[PDB]
Every structure is written in structure tokens, then in C-alpha cells.
Amino acid sequence: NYQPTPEDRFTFGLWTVGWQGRDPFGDATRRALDPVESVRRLAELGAHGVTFHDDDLIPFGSSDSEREEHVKRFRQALDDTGMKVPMATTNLFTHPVFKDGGFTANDRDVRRYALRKTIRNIDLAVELGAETYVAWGGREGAESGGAKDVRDALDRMKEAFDLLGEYVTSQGYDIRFAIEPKPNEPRGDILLPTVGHALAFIERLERPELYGVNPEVGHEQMAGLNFPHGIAQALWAGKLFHIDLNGQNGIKYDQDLRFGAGDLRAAFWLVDLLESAGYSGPRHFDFKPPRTEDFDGVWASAAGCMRNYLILKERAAAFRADPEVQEALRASRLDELARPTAADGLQALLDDRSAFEEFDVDAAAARGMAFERLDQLAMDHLLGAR
Amino acid sequence: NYQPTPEDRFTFGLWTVGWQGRDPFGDATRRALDPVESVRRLAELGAHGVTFHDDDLIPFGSSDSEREEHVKRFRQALDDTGMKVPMATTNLFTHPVFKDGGFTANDRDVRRYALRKTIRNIDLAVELGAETYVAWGGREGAESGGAKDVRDALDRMKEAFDLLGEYVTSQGYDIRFAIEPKPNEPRGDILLPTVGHALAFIERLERPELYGVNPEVGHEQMAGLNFPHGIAQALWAGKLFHIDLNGQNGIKYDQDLRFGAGDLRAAFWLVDLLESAGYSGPRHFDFKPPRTEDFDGVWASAAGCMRNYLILKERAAAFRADPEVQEALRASRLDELARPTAADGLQALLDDRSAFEEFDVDAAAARGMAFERLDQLAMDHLLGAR
Amino acid sequence: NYQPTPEDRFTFGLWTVGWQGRDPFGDATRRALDPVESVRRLAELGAHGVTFHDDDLIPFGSSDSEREEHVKRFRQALDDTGMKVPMATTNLFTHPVFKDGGFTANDRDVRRYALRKTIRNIDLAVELGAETYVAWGGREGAESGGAKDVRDALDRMKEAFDLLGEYVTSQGYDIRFAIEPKPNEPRGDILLPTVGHALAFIERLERPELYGVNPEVGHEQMAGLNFPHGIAQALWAGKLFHIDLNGQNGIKYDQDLRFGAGDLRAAFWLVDLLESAGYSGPRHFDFKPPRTEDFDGVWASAAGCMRNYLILKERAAAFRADPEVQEALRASRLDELARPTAADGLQALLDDRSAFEEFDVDAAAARGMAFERLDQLAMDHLLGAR
Amino acid sequence: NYQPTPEDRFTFGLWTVGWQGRDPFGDATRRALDPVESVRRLAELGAHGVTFHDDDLIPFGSSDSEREEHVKRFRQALDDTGMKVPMATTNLFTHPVFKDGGFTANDRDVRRYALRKTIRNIDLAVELGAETYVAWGGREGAESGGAKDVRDALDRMKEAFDLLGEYVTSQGYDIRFAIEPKPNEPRGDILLPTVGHALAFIERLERPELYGVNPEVGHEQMAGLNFPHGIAQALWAGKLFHIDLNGQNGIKYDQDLRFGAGDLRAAFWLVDLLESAGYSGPRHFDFKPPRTEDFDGVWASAAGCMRNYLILKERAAAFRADPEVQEALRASRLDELARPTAADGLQALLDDRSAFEEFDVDAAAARGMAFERLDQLAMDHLLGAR
Ligand SMILES: OC[C@H]1O[C@H](O)[C@H](O)[C@@H](O)[C@@H]1O
Ligand SMILES: OC[C@H]1O[C@H](O)[C@H](O)[C@@H](O)[C@@H]1O
Ligand SMILES: OC[C@H]1O[C@H](O)[C@H](O)[C@@H](O)[C@@H]1O
Ligand SMILES: OC[C@H]1O[C@H](O)[C@H](O)[C@@H](O)[C@@H]1O
Ligand SMILES: [Mg+2]
Ligand SMILES: [Mg+2]
Ligand SMILES: [Mg+2]
Ligand SMILES: [Mg+2]
Ligand SMILES: [Mg+2]
Ligand SMILES: [Mg+2]
Ligand SMILES: [Mg+2]
Ligand SMILES: [Mg+2]
Ligand SMILES: [Mg+2]
Ligand SMILES: [Mg+2]
Ligand SMILES: [Mg+2]
Ligand SMILES: [Mg+2]
């Protein structure tokens, strides 16, 4: 009954189940978790692996010796459990030095520091076997219009990513980058605010093939955007390297609810898309167990993430396998959407009097699309009412 | 006192001052305007030119002879007034045949019809001297998840734009395309919903150099996005071919208020950016005089569009010329943002102990950015309080 | 399998299934429906009754004789089918004369006309047996700040409703009023924009007992508000006289999707609340079959409204009857929320050293609320995964 | 040139200029401020007074002796500066014990503790001379639907406020309560989310005359609502006891920008309303100097709050005094909006054939409202372009 196994490729950030519950208006409600205990508890729940920021694993300002002891304890817990580390990232947002950004801070010496902090963790990530390195520029942005010339900032952002690309290729590392967009919070506006802006930016990098996106359900929904649509565009471009799964109730602060909470029907269409397109990357949960919860609630919340994915996967598969749904898809001409508009070419199109001069516009206009019957079949399948 | 001349390059769509005031809940409050009268009235107000959809100028379903008479009357009014036609577009949204889209309609015969309708108006646009051809895919999208496979739809969208690009190059036309994004309305979600998604899509076209964006103030703000930031990214990519100016009060239906209404400070930063970057295209107003207004209100509203642009232009120029502002920009290190992070290169950066090993993180963290003083200087300039 | 009967009290506006599909950017896609056919088709689907604006039933500007013939045909179809008319309303928004409002139009003669148009339809509503009379002030509002002094407008709004209350009581009519809030569209901002503002306004009327609210799912969600929470406040105040059910995907134009579409989990909690509180009024659907649909799609969409209500009703009832859920509610102390804080009174509270001086704040802080386990049980029940 | 004096009644919370810059993703960027220094610095800037939560002034868990020393130091600084304390409030949100609320926490013993903590600070507030006591229920709410029965929670909320009302009247205190609404953050949804919901709730209290609202600019704008409209409804009801001034850029996390930032035109219409209605309460700024700023930026930001109010006050006064504006107000029939619709009464209205039978609907429909000319005059005045 919806039990995960490591083959389902579910992963969690250390910072997720480890969130102590400090928010802008309140103190922590839970004690800190040792990374080692987190790995053990997640392995017992059926997770495939964990992810980390450098500063989750190695307390900021550790000596090189303390650093090695922290990595050794962590590696021992990975070996003890079979857990993998498919993704790593850099914390370029917590420390006060990053208050105006890392890669696009106005101060040049902060920008250089941000690059050196990132490069050091890329080495560690490769050693632990990470395949994707995520960059979330949470502090890259502004609260006021004059504080940031955005063209210069984009120059600085491109420079930083180009330099990281030169570093990995000069080291022969097999790692790819994924940019994680967010429209706002903690800055008033964040640069590269959506999947689309990030995809557009990547095409201006020196080595675009090394970069993709790491979209997050809740972040696109903070702009009121359709998350499955954005994921479809990222797949279409070949750029879906990683994904952050969670829940969000509309346009407000980033809630990071467990996956399946928030917009349930969007979660259904997302799972349908990922499974139909054969996405094979990690199913990563970037979520926060609400600060109302004790530690038993934390693990119930993490378990719920995986459970909801598996239930939705079953319902989406039943939806697509149902002969009556396959018939309704043809009734709505989804098969025709997949056929070329003009494989015959431009000149044939221009000579085709059935496409314009003799096109029966009123007859085509009268045909219903039958979309509502199709959508009610999808509802019936989601609710198990079929 | 803020009087426009044709050198200011202000343009208006025929559909703007010609909007009869029909909304989803009410009938028209104004009679229709003859395109010829609109050209004359706008010329008297100081406008530079007009834009049109095919169906604004030529009633849908006109014979070829009636078509020629409509164009002739229009051309005579352009010659009488000196008005230019810098942009044209296709109406692929009003007629019922486009209820599920034009370029991405599920029905293949509608998609072919949409292409032939567009190609016919490209010819007319070139004859009238338009330099930019805008495409707003207002019906390309969905209300439900199963109605549209977005990867197939993007295939169909790319196919359509590739075919238009083949047509203009095979005809030797000097015209470029601009895609106008909108997140929603009249479809529940529209494909290519923001500037960013449109920029990303263009990079997958066969001839990307022929395509740019036509962002609209209100459309990006319907996603809660920062419009000057999005414009900066479009300029950075070299893709700002055209712009739609209006006003919008936040995340709600597309209001199309006169420019300067809605988010006043965003309008100030937009004008500052366009004028500082040397944007030389038309300043096009895509706005709707509210249906409360009679015809005297329509022309007062159109006049207000141009007036507000000119006032904001004056205030932005005073802001940037003020020595105390130039000093505050240096205090906030905007000059350092414009300098390369690591022109010395990757190896020099890696060897630079001042960038990491000996970087004084606490000292850099203590420096204030002085952004609030800078933003209050900008406020004082906007309000004429200096 | 989820079949409605008239005992379920499902009702539909004539304007819902009768929506021709005209939106701000397109012409009608469906022919008009005769009110008589609509009554017959809805009766066959299992509906309990219909609602109407005066202008849905009687074409605007009909002579008194044509008026009587229209009512007679309608009454004959009600008798033929057994359909009831539980609610009626006035169209104070379509005709151009209402472009600046009805009850709060700046022009006094329009305000008087709006009152006479309303009073005439109250008579008709009582004759057809309506118990609730709805007022949706769709044009009461403004696009700009100086156009409407809101204190004077609220004076005019109170005056209008006070006069309607005097009319019904002087006629001895057994009818109550329900105000339907909406935050925006078609005006830039609408007066009484949410359930809360409407409830507050009612308490200033001369006869508050005659007035309640008619909240609509999508309207509260256009402000990002929690619709079940708002309904709970209306029930708490004793003011839920009527309800408009539909679906909405977040903060954007009013979509009026079929009920169950949009925010599915909000629909579940709404049905749970209405059924648990014993709401006995009509379950009224104010929805628009998308303009992609032909007439077969219209009736499939209407059927889906009722189906989704019945499925959600079953799942909510199973949720509340599940012993493991009843246990989890006690684990989360929902039983304690229902017990008075200080039935012992103020002085006992002040003397109770266990409430402050000797309260163990750290122990109380450590208790988890177990909300995530509870919410996953609700998810499992909604998805039929239990 | 726009210099404040204590007669302008500008006040600041200790928590505003004292915000250390900790947000959900970062550590503090500024050291803590001694309340005494804050009073001195604000007095030098021209402020009239300060406000406080109990826990801003007295560190949580202080002994009764340390408590007295903290109050004594504070009182000495008030006497040294002439600063007043017009408002006080309780912190029922920071400590982990309040993670599920104070007055509406599911645990009864937490609810009793919350009441005793509040009552203790009411005594202190009266001793310092506060006239208004604010309650912001930031933790009263839920992230999930089953966690909170809202009808029971409203029962508990009413019980708490009724008990506070009994306490102040039994002590003979001259203090009034103001409820501060917020739609969300830090809870997923907060009870009483807008001005309207709060006004409606007050009317169910035992002693409604003791309670009013403390609206905050940014909070109503987090629901996309028109803040001047909401303030007008609160004034109309006689319930505007206090106000929180700041800035907010649309629907997103609560930014608490300095007043004048965010929606500039809304700030203009707000100042016009407050000054025209003769609001005489404090002009309180609940704002956060951005964490990019050092202490010089903090005081520049606080100074900007007062400056922007004074500039807007000047522009609104010029707008209302301009004869051409007074003429345009009559052209738009604002004078008619202020006149009764039917002072002649119901029977006269029903007998008046000019109101319906002989009303010229087409003539009334043709009259333009001239709202756009009026709004451009307001724009010209705001920008100093007249
Ligand atoms: O960059 C990795 C992560 O960093 C932070 O935790 C962000 O909140 C999250 O969105 C991001 O994915
Ligand atoms: O495509 C040209 C225009 O068409 C329609 O009028 C749209 O509303 C507008 O946004 C667009 O710019
Ligand atoms: O007033 C009755 C109805 O009128 C209009 O159709 C509105 O769109 C709807 O919201 C309202 O309920
Ligand atoms: O209750 C007083 C204050 O408490 C908190 O600081 C809130 O953020 C603010 O909105 C409120 O006004
Ligand atoms: Mg997030
Ligand atoms: Mg996130
Ligand atoms: Mg993330
Ligand atoms: Mg628009
Ligand atoms: Mg537009
Ligand atoms: Mg446009
Ligand atoms: Mg609606
Ligand atoms: Mg509605
Ligand atoms: Mg309705
Ligand atoms: Mg706030
Ligand atoms: Mg606040
Ligand atoms: Mg506040």
C-alpha cells in the first residue's frame, strides 16, 4: 500500500527534515538534527538519498581538520545505510556577508568570495558522487529600483557561471549545473524569477550544455504560473536536470508544504507529465515540516511526501491506461495536436485552397472540443471514483 | 509643458482608443470609431503613428474589393496626416474558430488557417511600411490539464514561427517578429506566459535573429513580476524589439489602464531604463479608456499616456544628472557591480588568498549598502521634491 | 454511483448553462438557450431548481404584455418539471446606464432607476416562490481614486438596502436578502470586496436580520483568501443564506469553473463544513461551461458540478466517521479547542497560578500538534486511498 | 522642507528601527538596539512617540525586579525626550509555546497563559499612558484544514476579547482595543484576515464600543485589496482607532517597506483620505529597514517614512484646493454621490414616473463620467507637474 523503496529515487535535503522551525516571527520549535541521524531515519522510511548545502554538513568557519571529521562521519553513515548523494549546493544566503547577493553582490570582493566558497563545495560534491550541482540565487535581487543595474548584474551572473563551467571542465568533473528560480523572498524581487527566465539565461552562457534548471513547485506558483506547463517547456528544451517537489497554497510567502498539499490537481498533472516523459532524475523534496510539529510529525510529514507521489503515480497511470480516456483524448483531437501542421511545406500550404479560400470557418467553429468530459474523467480517476 | 511631438515616437493601436467598452459583464458604451477618424485625432494629439490587427482595418470576411477600398481610405489618411504604421499584428483570438487557439489549436485545419490568415496580413504590413510584426497568442493555452500536451503544442508553435520566418526570408521582407507574452486571460493559462518563457522559446527557433519580444507592462505584473527587471533581461539578450505601455493594479484581470496609472514607481524605473539604454523603438500604448468615459474621455486618456511618459522622462533624467545621486550610486557601489568579478581569470582567482583564506568576512558583512538613502533620493526626484 | 436527485437541492442560474461564451477578447461560440429548454434539460440531469436575473427571463425593454407571456411560458415549464426557483436577482451591470454602478452610481437619477428595477423584480421573485434575493454589486466601485468617495458610496449603498428592507416589510413578503461579494472585475476595485466586508456592512443596516451573504468560491479566492474559513465566519454569525459554488485557479480573472475544478482540497473542506454544520440552503452553481465546449459539453460540465459535490460529500463523511481520524482529532486537541478558555471567569483566571506564575512554558512548547498526520489522513480519504 | 515636528504625531514601534535583519533565510545583520537609544534617536528625528510589545521592553522571563529596572530606564528616557507612548501590544507569536496561537491555540492551558500575559501588559501600558492596545493574532490560524475548527476558534477569540473588555472596565481603565488583521504569514491562513472580517467580528463582542481596527497598508495589499477603500469603510463604521503605515509591492511576503515605497498612488489616496476625514490618531510606522542597511541606513529609512507622509500631505491638499479640480469633481458628479438617493421616501420613489416609466435610459447611458481627466489632474498634482 504505497510503500517507497530506494528504486523510486526519493531524496530529501538535510535542511528539510532538519528545519528547526525559525520563521520571521518566531524562535525554533525543534532541536537541531545531526546529519547522521537524518540519514538513518530517511533510509528507514525508504528514501533513496540526501542532498546538502555545504553549511548544512560543515559548520561555517570550521577548520580544515574539523571539516574532514564532519565528512568522515557523514560518509560512514552513507555506507552504513546505502544512501546516495545525487545533488549538492552552496549556501550563499544565510551569512550576513551575502546580504546583497553572492554572484551579483555590488561589492566585488564578496563576489570573488562567493565563487571560492562554491568551488570548494563542488570538489566535495564530486567526491561524494553528486551528479547535479544546484544554484539558488536567493539573495541576487533588490528591494528598490536603483540598488541594482540588472544588465550589469546579469553580466556578473553570466561571468560567475561561465567560471564555474571552466572549473569543472578543466578538472574533468562529470557534474552538471541546475539553476533554481524563485520570484521573490527573501529579496523583494529575485533575478531569474521563473523557469522561463532561467532557461533564457542559460542560452547566453559559454557552455550551455552544462546547465539546466531545478524548478520548484511552490516557486512557480508564487507567480501564479502553471507548474506542469513550465516543466513541459523545460523538458521540451532538454533542460530538466533536477526537480524540487513540495506544495504551495497560491500567491503568498514560500510555504514549502509537503508534496501533495497545496494544489492537488497540479500535483496530479505534474506526476502524469514526469512519468509519461520518462524523467529519470531524483524526486527531491524541498519541504519544511510545519513548526507546529514535534519530531514524530517531521517523519510523518516526510513519509507523506513519498506516499502522495506514489498514490498520484498510480492514479495517473490508471487515467492514461483507461480505454475510455484514450477515446476521449481522440474526441478532443490530442492526436491531431501531435501531427505536423504543414509537413507538406510552405509552398504547398500557400497553394492549398482548403486552408483559406475554401476553408469552412463556421463548420470548424461549431465543433466542440469535449474538454470538460475529458477533465471529469481525470477528476474521477484522481478521486478513485471509477 | 510636456507636449508630445511625432519625434517622441508615441504610437497607439487602433483597438485602444477604438475600444467600445464591451467587457465580460456589459454591453458597449461607445459607438465604433472609423479608423480614419482615429488617425486624424491621434495626429492632432501629437502621436507618431498607429498599429492595427488585420481585423481592425478590414472587417472579417470582406471581399477582395472591399479589402482594397478599406486599405485605400486608410492610406489616404496616413498621407494626409504624416502618421506612420510601425507595427502590425494578426487577430487570432476573436472569431469562434480560434476558441482553442490558432497556431496550437488541436484541430490541424484551424492551425493551417491561422497561418494563412497571418501570412496575408504580413504582406499588407510590409506594404504599409511596418518594421515589426507582433504575435500575441491569446488563445494558445488551456483551462484544464488534459486538453493540451504542452510539448506537442510547443512543437506546433515552433513550426508556425519557423514557417513565418521562411516566408519573410523567401520574400526578402525587412520585417522582424515580436512575441507578446501574457500569463492568463482569456485562457486559464497561456503558453509562453512571461518575457522569460518567450525569450527561451525564441532560442529554439530555426532563425532566432528574426524574433524578439514585445513585453507589456500589465502582463508581467499579472504574474507579480518586476517589469523593469524583465525589460532589462530582454535588452541584455538584445531582444527588445517593441514594447506595450500601460498600467495595471496588481494581480487581477488585465486592466490596460493608461500609462502612468497602476504602479507609478515601476513606470519611473521603466522610463529610466528605456532612456538610459537608448531604446529607439516605438513607445506603443496598448491601453483601454475605461468604459465610464465618453469620447472626450477617450482622448483625454490617450493624451495622459504621452504626458505621463514625458513627465517621468524628465524626472528620471534629473535623477541621473544630480551630482548627489551620482555620489550615492558610488556609495552603494553600483560602479563596482559594473566591474568584472574575475578579469584576472580562474587560476588567479583560485590562487588569490584575499578572496577566501584571508578574506575578512565580518568586515565585509558590516558595510551598509546605503540603498535606502539612494531610494529616497529617487522618490524625491519623482515627486519633484528636490 | 453519485447520481443527484432533487432532494440534494442542486440549483443552477439560467445564465450559467446559458452563457454563450462571449469574453473580453472573443465572440459567442454557442447560440442562446431558451429558458424553457434549460429548465427541461436541468430537470433531466437531476437538478432541484433554477435561478435568474430579471434580464435573463424578460428581455430588457419588454412591454408589459411581452413580460407576461415570458413569465407564463417559464411557469408552465416549472410546473411540467417540478423545478423550483429558490433565488432571484437583478441585473444591475450589463446595460450601459449602469457603467458607474447602480446603487452607488454618481448620478442620482441612475440610483433611483436601479432601485425601481430591483423592486419590480422582487415582486416577480415572490410570485415564483423565491426565498432569497441576491444582490451582486458588480459595477459598484472604481478604477481610480478620485472617482468615488467611498464613505458617501457606503451611505448610498446603505440607503438602497434600507429602502429594499422597508419595501419587503411593508409588503409583508417572506424574502431575505443576500449580498454577494467580489473583490474586482469588472470594476478595478468593487465595494464590499470580501465576505468580511459584507458581514460588517450588514450590521449597519436598519434591519440587519433581513440580510445575509451569498459567498462565491472563486471570488474569495481572487483575493487569495481561504474560502472554508470565510464560510465558517459567515455561519458563526448566522448569515450564510445562500452559496455560489464553482472553481477558480488562484488570483486571476473570475474563471467560474465547474465545482470541483480549481482548488480541490478547498472544495473538500468546504463540503465537510457545509455538511457538518447542517447547511440546508440551495447548493447553487454559478459556473460557466468553457467556450471551447458545444452543447454536449455544457451539460457534461453541469453534470460534473453535481457529481463532484456528491463524491466530496462521501469522502468527507468517511473522513469524519473513521475511528482513526476521531483519535487523531483528539491527538491534535480539537476537543480542547471546543472547550471554554475560562468558564471559571476573570477573577478565577487572575488567581490561577497554574495559568502564569507556575505555568511550565517549556513543557507546553515541546508538545507537537500532530497536524501533519491528521492532514495525511484527510488526504488519504480524499483520494480513496484508505 | 518637509521637516517633522512632534505635532505631526509620527510614531514608531521599538521593533521597527530595532529589527536586527533576521529573515527566514539569514542571520541578523545589525546588532540589537537598546530601547533607550532608540527613543533618543527617534526624538532627534522629530518623532512624537514610540510603541512596544511587552517583550521588546522586558526580556522574556525577567524577574519582577529586572522588570522594574527595565521600565524605570525606559520612563527616564521618555521624560528626558518628551516622547509619548500612545499604543502598546503583546507579543503572542515569538515564543514556541505560541506555535499554534495564543487566544485560539488548541491547548486550553496555552490560551489561559496567553490571556494572563496580555493582562499583565495592559497594566503596564496604562501606567505609561497608552490610549490604544493593539492585538495582532499572528499565530491564530492554520496550515491545514482539519487542524482548526474555525467556528470553535472564533468562539475562543470572542471569549478572549470579551474577557479583556471585562478586565479594563472592571479596572476603570481608559484604553481601547484595536485588532490588526493580516491574511497570512506566519500561518498559512490567519483568522480575521482583512479589515472587513475584523469589523464583522467586533460586532459580535459583548462591548463592541471598546474595539476598533488597526489596519496595516501592506497587509490589505497582501490580499490584493484597495487599502484606502478599506480605511474608508473603517472610518464609515467609526472604528479607525489606529493605523500602521508602510509599503508593500503587491501580493507576496509581508515586506514592511518604509511608507511611500510600494504602491505610491495608494499612499497618496490614503493620505488624502486620512487628512480629509480628520483622523487624529497616531501616524504609526510599522516598517523594517532592509537588512542591506547599517545603522545610518536605519535612520535614513525612518526619516523617509515621515518625509514621504509630509510630501504626500502637501500634494493632496493642493489637489483638493485647486479650483480646476473642484470643477472636475462636479463634472464627475461627486457632489451628486453625496446627496440622498430618495430622501423623499419609498412611496414617493414608487410613484415617481421619472425614475422608471419615463426615465430616459439611453440619455443617461450616454453621459461620460469624466473620470480620466480627474485622475490625470490627480497625477499632475502628485508629480508636482502643475
Ligand atoms: O539551493 C538549495 C536550496 O536552498 C534553500 O534552502 C532554498 O530555500 C531552496 O529553495 C533551495 O533549493
Ligand atoms: O497582439 C496585439 C494585441 O492584441 C490584443 O489586443 C491584446 O489584448 C494585446 O495584448 C495585444 O498586444
Ligand atoms: O448576482 C447574480 C450573479 O450575477 C452575475 O452573473 C455574476 O457574475 C455572479 O457572480 C452573480 O452571482
Ligand atoms: O501587534 C503589533 C505588531 O506585531 C508584529 O510586529 C507584526 O509584525 C505587526 O504587524 C504588528 O503590528
Ligand atoms: Mg520554496
Ligand atoms: Mg524553496
Ligand atoms: Mg528548492
Ligand atoms: Mg493587456
Ligand atoms: Mg494586453
Ligand atoms: Mg499588448
Ligand atoms: Mg464568479
Ligand atoms: Mg461570480
Ligand atoms: Mg456568483
Ligand atoms: Mg507587515
Ligand atoms: Mg505587519
Ligand atoms: Mg503592523
C-alpha cell at C247: 472553481
Confirm or reject contact between C382 and chain A (CB < 8 A).
Answer: yes
Residue located via cell numbers 463544513 = C273
Classify burial at C27, counting beta carbons within 10 Å of its beta carbon; exposed 0-12, middle 13-18, buried 19 or more: middle
Q: Are strands D141-142 and D189-190 parallel, antiparallel or unpaired?
A: antiparallel
Ligand 3 binding pocket (C-beta < 6 A) is C 15, 89, 134, 136, 180, 216, 244, 286
Place of cell 542560452: A203
Q: At residue B212, what are phi and psi to the nearest 5 degrees? A: -140, -160
Amino acid at A128: L
B154: nearest Cα among B115, B192, B206? B192
Residues 6 or more apart whose CB falls under 8 angstroms from that of B147 comprise A332, A334, A369, A371, A374, A375, B100, B106, C292
- Here the contacts of D102-105 (C-beta below 8 Å, separation 24 or greater) are D102/D137, D102/D139, D102/D140, D103/C341, D103/D137, D103/D140, D103/D156, D103/D157, D103/D160, D103/D161, D104/C337, D104/D137, D104/D140, D104/D148, D104/D153, D104/D156, D104/D157, D104/D160, D104/D191, D105/D139
Q: How far apart are CA D351 and CA B117, in angstroms?
A: 58
Query: 3-state class of A71 per DSSP?
Result: helix
**Any ligand 1 atom below 6 A from CB of A180:** yes
Q: At what angle do helices D227-236 and C195-202 cross, to 10 degrees?
A: 20
Q: Which amino acid is at B356?
A: F
Q: Which of D56, D263, D272, D284 is catalytic?
A: D56
CB of D318 within 8 Å of a chain C CB? The answer is no
What is the A112 CA–ligand 14 centroid distance (Å)? 35
Q: Report residue C357: phi and psi, to 5°.
A: -55, -40
With CB atoms and an 8 Å threshold, state whether C29 touches A365: yes
A235 in B contact zone (CB under 8 Å): yes
Query: Does the domain formed by D1-386 have CATH 3.40.47.10?
Result: no
The DSSP line for D257-270 is BPBTBS-HHHHHHH
The alpha carbon of residue B33 is apart from the nearest alpha carbon of chain C, in Å, by 18
Angle, in degrees to the nearest 10, between helices B227-236 and A150-171: 60
Instruction: Please give the residue of chain C at the shortest CA–CA distance from D351.
Output: C116
Q: What is the DSSP letter of A247?
A: B
Report how far residue B336's alpha carbon sits from residue A147's, in angstroms, rounded to the nearest whole number: 12
Q: Which helix (H) or strand (E) holds D327?
A: helix D323-331
Pocket test for ligand 4, best of D16, D286, D287 (most atoms within 8 A of CB): D286
Asked if A147 and D292 come within 8 Å (Cβ–Cβ), the reply is yes
Strand pairing class (B141-142; B189-190)? antiparallel
Pairing mode of beta strands A189-190, A141-142: antiparallel
Cβ atoms within 10 A of the Cβ of D89, count? 25
Torsion angles phi and psi, residue D129, rounded to 5: 90, 15
Contact B61, B70 (CB under 8 A): no
Q: Is C296 on the interface with A (CB under 8 A)?
A: yes
C-alpha cell at C145: 481614486
Determine the atom of ligand 2 nearest the C-alpha atom of C25: 8
Q: Which residue in C149, B8, C109 sits closest to D374, CA to CA? A: C149
- C24 close to B (CB below 8 A): yes
Q: Is C294 annotated as a binding residue?
A: no
Look at the block and give the residue holding cell 528547526.
A20
The stretches of B133-221 forming alpha helices (DSSP H) are 150-171, 195-202, 217-221
Phi and psi for C118 in degrees, rounded to 5? -70, -45
Q: At D316, list the grid cell.
A: 493632496
Give CA–CA dist D201/B316, Å, rounded: 47
Q: Which atom of ligand 4 is nearest to the CA of D135?
A: 1
Partners of A192 on chain B (C-beta within 8 Å) are 196
Q: Which three cell numbers stand for residue B141?
A: 493555452
Q: Which helix (H) or strand (E) holds A162?
A: helix A150-171
Does a cis peptide bond (omega within 30 degrees of 0) precede residue C86? no
Strands C10-13 and C49-53: parallel
Q: End-to-end CA distance of chain D: give it in Å, rounded.
A: 19
- Cβ atoms of residues A381 and A315 within 8 Å: yes
Ordered DSSP codes for A345-383: -HHHHHH-GGGTTT--HHHHHH----HHHHHHHHHHHHT
Quickly count: other Cβ atoms within 10 Å of residue B3's Cβ: 11
Residues with Cβ within 8 Å of residue A65, at least 6 apart in sequence: none
C-alpha cell at D210: 471598546
Spatial distance between the Cα atoms of A288 and A18, rounded to a whole number of angstroms = 8
Q: Say how far residue D75 (Cα) sits from the centre of its chain.
A: 25
Decide if D185 and A100 are in contact by the 8 Å CB cutoff.
no
A256 close to ligand 1 (CB < 6 Angstrom): no
Q: Which of A16, A372, A377, A386 to mutate to test the interface with C (most CBs of C within 10 A)?
A: A372
State the closest ligand 4 atom to the C-alpha of D219, by its place in the atom list counted from 1.
10
Provide the 3-class DSSP secondary structure of residue B85: strand
- Which residues precede a break in chain B, with C-to-N distance above 2.5 Å? none
Cα–Cα distance, C277 to C237 (Å, whole number): 13
The cell numbers describing C157, all together, are 449603498
For residue D290, say if its preceding peptide bond is cis, omega within 30 degrees of 0: no
Query: Who contacts B225 (Cβ-Cβ below 8 Å, separation ≥6)?
Result: A183, A189, A193, A194, A223, B194, B195
DSSP-assigned letter for residue C165: H
End-to-end CA distance of chain C: 19
Pairwise CB contact (< 8 Å): A370 & C301: no
Would you say C79 is a known binding-site residue? Answer: no
Q: What kind and span of H or E run contains A86?
A: strand A84-89
Distance separating alpha carbons of residues C33 and A281, to the nearest angstrom: 51
Question: What chains are in contact with C, requiring at least 3 Cβ pairs below 8 Å?
Answer: A, B, D
Which residue from C minimizes the CA distance to B141?
Answer: C292
Cis omega (within 30 of 0) on the bond before A86?
no
Instruction: Test D93 with A26 for CB contact under 8 angstroms.
Output: yes
Q: Which residues surround ligand 12, an ion (CB under 5 A)?
A: C 216
Q: What is the β-pairing status of strands A189-190 and C244-245?
A: unpaired
Q: Please tell me the distance from the alpha carbon of residue B54 to that of residue B114, in angstroms, as a whole number.
A: 12
CB contact under 8 A, C349 and D163: yes
Contacts of D292 in chain A (CB under 8 A): 99-100, 143, 147
Tell whether A62 lies on the interface with B, counting CB pairs under 8 A. no
C-alpha to C-alpha distance for C15 and C13, rounded to whole angstroms:
5
Adjacency order of strands within the sheet including D84-89 = D211-213, D176-179, D132-135, D84-89, D49-53, D10-13, D283-285, D244-245
CB C258 within 8 A of CB C308: yes
Are residues A151 and B337 in contact, defined by beta-carbon separation less than 8 angstroms?
no
> Residue written as cell 483575493?
C223
Contact D24, A22 (CB under 8 A): yes
| Interface contact flag, D113 C223, Cβ < 8 Å | no
Tell me the chain C residues in contact with residue A379 when contact means C-beta distances shorter than 8 Å. Answer: 260-261, 304, 308
- Closest Cβ opposite residue C372 in set A29, A300, A384: A300
Residue A204 near residue A157, CB atoms below 8 Å: no
Q: Which residue in the set C29, C94, C184 is minimally distant from B96, CB to CB?
A: C29
- Give the one of C29, C368, C383 whose C-beta lies nearest to A384's C-beta: C383
Interface size, chain A vs chain B, as Cβ–Cβ contacts under 8 Å: 321
Residue D265, chain C, CB below 8 Å: the answer is: yes
Report the DSSP pairing between strands B283-285 and B10-13: parallel
Instruction: For chain D, say whether C205 makes contact (Cβ under 8 Å).
Output: no
Q: D342: which DSSP letter? A: -
The verdict on B333 touching D (C-beta cutoff 8 Å) is: no
In this structure, is the dihedral angle defined by the CA atoms of residues C101, C104, C108 and C111, taken in order, positive or negative?
positive
- How close is the Cα of D138 to the center of ligand 15, in Å? 9
Residue D89, ligand 4, Cβ within 6 A: yes
Q: How far is CA B350 from the centre of its chain?
A: 43
- For residue A134, the ligand 1 atom closest to its alpha carbon is 1
With CA atoms as reference, report the closest residue to D118 among D166, D65, D184, D77: D166
Q: Is D56 a catalytic residue?
A: yes
Active-site residue C56, yes or no? Answer: yes
Instruction: State the CB neighbour count (10 A cutoff) for residue C260.
Output: 27
ω into D186 cis (within 30 of 0)? yes
Q: What is the C201 CA–ligand 11 centroid distance (Å)? A: 21
d(CA A57, CA A333): 52
What's the gap between Cα A383 and its chain centre? Answer: 26
Q: Compute the distance between CA of residue A8 and CA of residue A313 in angstroms, rounded to an integer.
A: 11
Question: Candidates C11, C20, C89, C216: which one to mutate for ligand 3, based on the most atoms within 8 Å of Cβ?
Answer: C89
Does the CB of D2 have a partner CB in chain B at under 8 Å? Answer: yes
User: Which one of the listed residues C48, C54, C55, C56 is annotated catalytic?
Assistant: C56
Q: Which ligand is nearest to the CA of A215?
A: 7
Q: How was this structure determined?
A: X-ray
Q: What span, in angstroms and rounded, lies between the C-alpha atoms of C143 and B301?
A: 13
CB within 8 Å of D277: residues ≥ 6 apart: C151, D235
In the chain, the amino acid numbered A45 is L
Say how far residue A261 (Cα) sits from the centre of its chain.
Answer: 16
CB under 8 Å to A28, separation ≥6 — which residues?
A20, A21, A22, D96
Determine whether the annotation assigns residue D159 to a binding site. Answer: no
Q: How many C-alpha atoms does C316 have within 13 Å on its Cβ side?
A: 22
Q: Per the annotation, does D256 bind a ligand? A: yes
Residue extents of the structural domains in chain C: 1-386
A322 marked as binding residue: no
Distance CA(C53)–CA(C118), nearest Å, equals 10
D15 in contact with ligand 4, CB cutoff 6 A: yes
Chain A stretch 112-151, residues whose beta carbon is closer than 8 A to a beta carbon of chain C: none
Within 8 A by CB and 6+ apart from D5, the residues are D46
- DSSP states of C40-63 as a string? HHHHHHT--EEEEEHHHHS-TT--
Do A170 and A126 form a contact (C-beta atoms < 8 A)?
A: no
D296 marked as binding residue: no
User: What does the block give as the cell for A78?
Assistant: 552513507
Residue closest by Cα to atom 1 of ligand 2: B136
Angle at A110 (CA atoms; ends A105, A116), nearest 5 degrees? 120
Could you tell me the CA-to-CA distances from B241 to B88, B134, D25, D336 in Å, in that order? 13, 10, 38, 48
Cα distance between residue A45 and residue A4, in whole Å: 8
